[PDB]
Amino acid sequence: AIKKYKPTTNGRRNMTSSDFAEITTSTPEKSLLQPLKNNAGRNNNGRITVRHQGGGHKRQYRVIDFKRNKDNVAAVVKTIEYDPNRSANIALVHYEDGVKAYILAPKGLEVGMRLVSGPEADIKVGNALPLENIPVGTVIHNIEMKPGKGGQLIRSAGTSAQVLGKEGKYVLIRLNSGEVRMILATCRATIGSVGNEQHELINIGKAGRSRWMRKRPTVRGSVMNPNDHPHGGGEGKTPIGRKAPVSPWGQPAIGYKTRNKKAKSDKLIVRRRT
Amino acid sequence: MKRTYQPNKRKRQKVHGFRKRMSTKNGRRVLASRRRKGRKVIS
Amino acid sequence: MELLDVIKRPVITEKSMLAMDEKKYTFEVDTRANKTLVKQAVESAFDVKVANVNILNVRPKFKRMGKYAGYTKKRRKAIVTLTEDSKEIQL
RNA sequence: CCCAUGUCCAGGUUGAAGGUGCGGUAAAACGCACUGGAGGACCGAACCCACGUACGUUGAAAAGUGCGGGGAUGAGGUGUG
RNA sequence: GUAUGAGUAGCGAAAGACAGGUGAGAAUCCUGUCCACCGUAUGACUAAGGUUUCCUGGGGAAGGCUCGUCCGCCCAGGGUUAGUCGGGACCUAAGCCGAGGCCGAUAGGCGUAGGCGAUGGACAACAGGUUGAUAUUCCUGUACCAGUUGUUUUUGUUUGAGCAAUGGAGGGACGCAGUAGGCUAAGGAAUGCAUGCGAUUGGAAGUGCAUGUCCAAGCAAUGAGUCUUGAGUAGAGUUAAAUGCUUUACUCUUUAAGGACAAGUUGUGACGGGGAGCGAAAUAAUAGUAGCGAAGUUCCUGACGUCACACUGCCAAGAAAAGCUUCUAGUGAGAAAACAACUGCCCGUACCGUAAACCGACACAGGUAGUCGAGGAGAGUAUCCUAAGGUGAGCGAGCGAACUCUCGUUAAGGAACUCGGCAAAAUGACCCCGUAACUUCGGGAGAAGGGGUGCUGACUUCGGUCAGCCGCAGUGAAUAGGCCCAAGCGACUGUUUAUCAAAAACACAGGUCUCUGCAAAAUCGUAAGAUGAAGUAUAGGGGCUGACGCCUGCCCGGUGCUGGAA
RNA sequence: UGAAAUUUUAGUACCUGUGAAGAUGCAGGUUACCCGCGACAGGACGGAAAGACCCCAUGGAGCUUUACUGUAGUUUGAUAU
Ligand SMILES: [K+]
Ligand SMILES: [K+]
Ligand SMILES: [K+]
Ligand SMILES: [K+]
Ligand SMILES: [K+]
Ligand SMILES: [Mg+2]
Ligand SMILES: [Mg+2]
Ligand SMILES: [Mg+2]
Ligand SMILES: [Mg+2]
Ligand SMILES: [Mg+2]
Ligand SMILES: [Mg+2]
Ligand SMILES: [Mg+2]
Ligand SMILES: [Mg+2]
Ligand SMILES: [Mg+2]
Ligand SMILES: [Mg+2]
Ligand SMILES: [Mg+2]
Ligand SMILES: [Mg+2]
Ligand SMILES: [Mg+2]
Ligand SMILES: [Mg+2]
Ligand SMILES: [Mg+2]
Ligand SMILES: [Mg+2]
Ligand SMILES: [Mg+2]
Ligand SMILES: [Mg+2]
Ligand SMILES: [Mg+2]
Ligand SMILES: [Mg+2]
Ligand SMILES: [Mg+2]
Ligand SMILES: [Mg+2]
Ligand SMILES: [Mg+2]
Ligand SMILES: [Mg+2]
Ligand SMILES: [Mg+2]
Ligand SMILES: [Mg+2]
Ligand SMILES: [Mg+2]
Ligand SMILES: [Mg+2]
Ligand SMILES: [Mg+2]
Ligand SMILES: [Mg+2]
Ligand SMILES: [Mg+2]
Ligand SMILES: [Mg+2]
Ligand SMILES: [Mg+2]
Ligand SMILES: [Mg+2]
Ligand SMILES: [Mg+2]
């Protein structure tokens, strides 16, 4: 659920957070861990390529089976766990052959619940089926785009796709963001929503807590100098003395679309919202 | 009042060293200019 | 290198004489040398059975004569401690 | 500014959630105590910073000293690479 | 090059005085006695950096802001000893290089394998002495790690003991805060104990004065205690195998038992060494130096040092790799222990190190990582005075003018000064009482405002309390808030023009709009390639606003954008 | 013991006036033995600095844009692969 801290201090005033009711352990598995270098927006060349990042708490990477290659071998849930690299929670599963693994803990999942994959699999949460073998109307998550690449699309919190039809070799899929799309039918997906629908509600209350979340400060270009941003400069406080407010480069900020108009997937996209 | 030269043998030789200069191409020019000049301290 | 060019000379000093009176002798050595080579060298040069060998390498000592300044050469000084039931090297 | 790896923050204080018990209830909201020990919380050394003032202003100093000053478990200070 | 200013400013924060000595010459050097300064340091370790500044013996040409017989200066000599300390012959992070390869006017850029690379991980020693200068290094004892040869005792010889992988597994292996608790440094130096001595200034041979009031590493045993349920069937899998590892069901046990882990304690080590002090000639012992050597208890306090990230809680969810253990695959006729002996490389090791040796042009009032850092009073590393120990500031003497600076008092008044209460003054610790408007019910609040505080006896059930005494005054000194009323700005903690602006400026949580379906969008770059992301619309990027509350009206004609289409 | 800035030479008075228009130095008149010490700071249009205000230069640099001319990118099409 959500915690609502009392207002002892002006930082803690209107803060909220999660009580982490759905988590059974703070004790992850020593095998599925890998390290993370925080890049802080820097790149191969050391230059800032993505602003407003870096400087927070250390993290590890938790190897997750988005692919679900393993078929006709069940897997029983033991624990739900915090993953800092994402918004959602995760879950530990032992395959009966003894393989340990993490997966993306869907909504309505509980310890002891048992999961499978393949066409013979059943229409229940946590089970990874190809879009061939999934009926219309069902909510899914952990969708992939190319077979064997692994789940790409529906992996974050409180997200929910929905099958809506087919066209032969493809499947028609509504996504979060309202976009309808044709997706290759042999792509695997898992049933249900993704997990903690309450993460959207968390107020943060502290700049320092944003820092812990690795988010540097955003500086506005209406205050920078003219060399620094196209909105910079001006005596006193300046409006946007331009048409089409812009990025630090010449890209407009509002309205200008950025999808390549040569995109091969435009034939697949049926109805887009964004 | 802290100052600009906080010495360090390691940083000095890792930046301004023979290995570094001879590794880069444009350090080959520097060293060869110490010699044409006729330096006793090539690095 | 060769065992006799390993060793160069002894070090006649007060400390070294005080060590001679405790049965361990100082020797200047090739700067590229090794402790086991000093051992082999003395054992072949005196038929004395060596017990232990210490080594120092001395920095070059600044000097000057008029306008011109420079450095004394580097040195390596071994200290060869002998056994009992052994001879005492005569210098 | 950032990456990794380490390290430092005397002492004292206040007393959030949660929990327990006793009331009260048809049972609860609720209340009273105790526990607990949170905080970009408080006072204040080192540490960090530089608000004012005087002095210095061919300075002890190519930006300081003194008298006070602000922060001081964090968005902290600092070291090495 | 030499004048001018001018023999002027300055001689760089602070306490020295005296007697003797050395010497041509003494405020300045040496010895000594008093005195003062530091003491969470102005002390003792030590990384970096410096790189010979260290020690001895001479010197006073220059340097030292004076002098100088002296020095971190000059001259001649010497000085740094490691199987165990730190680093390499061990491991790897960030980052770097990079076979081949990819990309590219050239040059080259990127990057895989594989390497490098500590600030981390792993890794076998410590007590004393000793030099003029080195000390876990040298010396004496006592060990420990890896290895070699030999002797002795065992057992394996190919249905084969043992070694055993780069292969499989485990382990290594980790955050922040918060208290309890145990143990031990440490301290009181309270107590006893040992040694020495009765003070001439009025008193004291006693509950007088002073000083001290120990010892490893290793071996053995023990252990405050702390973690962890563990055994067994049917199995599936562990790129092939496996007695090892993982796990699905199933039974029994779970205050338990078993298995690990442990600070520390005791006995040895130790018939040794240290140690108050006493104290040798033949004297460069021109001694306090060889040398000799007592006792080393009890009680109280008591550590975030350690057990130990052990436990609890929390969210921001907290390196890896190798050593190490096991498994077999493989290999295999030699291996295990006891004893004796032997071997163990390379670099650093001096000295400075909150500084006159580093960085600042200087022997510069600046800055310089970490460890130890005692006592009384005290919560305390604050503060005052002291301990161990270390210093006495590299110009002085006198006279005690104006004026400048740093300080201290002040009649009466009390902000009349002033741009302005600037500066200074006043308050300041602890205990108790008491404490408003307003409020996001948390606060405001240490509000305000008051009172008390010393000493000596009784008294408690240990803090209150009573009585008495003294002073102008009792946190008697030092160290510690001035407060209140109201208004504007910004909500807040924070950041900001290194060197004239600390702010109402920036950020901030929050809000909104917009883009983006994943080879994203955006960005760096010729491109490869990379960030974004080892993320995936509750995610990310960009613009604006800026906590919270009530709100956020009308305008799409214009300029843009989006979509459309004859 | 031992500098520095500055410095055309200097035996370097005052009033009034003159004068590149505000004189230690020219004039007329007046006052004033020579040399110093400590203090002050009215002047030497004092020192420091080729005015930063202003104007000029067919000077420069940064910045803006519905100034000009271009261009990297973005996009559309033709053609080749
Ligand atoms: K290290
Ligand atoms: K103290
Ligand atoms: K319009
Ligand atoms: K004047
Ligand atoms: K211009
Ligand atoms: Mg601005
Ligand atoms: Mg612009
Ligand atoms: Mg305006
Ligand atoms: Mg503008
Ligand atoms: Mg050595
Ligand atoms: Mg605070
Ligand atoms: Mg404070
Ligand atoms: Mg510091
Ligand atoms: Mg300022
Ligand atoms: Mg003068
Ligand atoms: Mg001085
Ligand atoms: Mg102090
Ligand atoms: Mg000396
Ligand atoms: Mg002199
Ligand atoms: Mg000398
Ligand atoms: Mg490269
Ligand atoms: Mg690598
Ligand atoms: Mg008497
Ligand atoms: Mg030393
Ligand atoms: Mg001095
Ligand atoms: Mg008065
Ligand atoms: Mg007035
Ligand atoms: Mg004031
Ligand atoms: Mg007081
Ligand atoms: Mg007004
Ligand atoms: Mg503010
Ligand atoms: Mg502030
Ligand atoms: Mg400033
Ligand atoms: Mg704003
Ligand atoms: Mg004029
Ligand atoms: Mg005139
Ligand atoms: Mg004339
Ligand atoms: Mg004079
Ligand atoms: Mg002038
Ligand atoms: Mg000019």
Numbering used by the authors:
A (entry chain G): 2 to 275
B (entry chain 6): 1 to 43
C (entry chain W): 1 to 91
Provide the authors' own sentences about this structure as they appear in the paper.
One class of such proteins are the antibiotic resistance (ARE) ATP-binding cassette (ABC) proteins of the F-subtype (ARE-ABCFs), which are widely distributed throughout Gram-positive bacteria and bind the ribosome to alleviate translational inhibition from antibiotics that target the large ribosomal subunit. Here, we present single-particle cryo-EM structures of ARE-ABCF-ribosome complexes from three Gram-positive pathogens: Enterococcus faecalis LsaA, Staphylococcus haemolyticus VgaALC and Listeria monocytogenes VgaL. In each instance, the globular NBDs of the ARE-ABCF were bound in the E-site, and the α-helical interdomain linker, consisting of two α-helices (α1 and α2) and the ARD loop, extended towards the PTC. Our structures and mutagenesis experiments support an indirect mechanism of ARE-ABCF action, in which a conformational selection in the PTC, elicited by ARE binding to the ribosome, leads to antibiotic egress, and hint at a rationalization for the specificity of LsaA, VgaALC and VgaL for PLSA antibiotics.
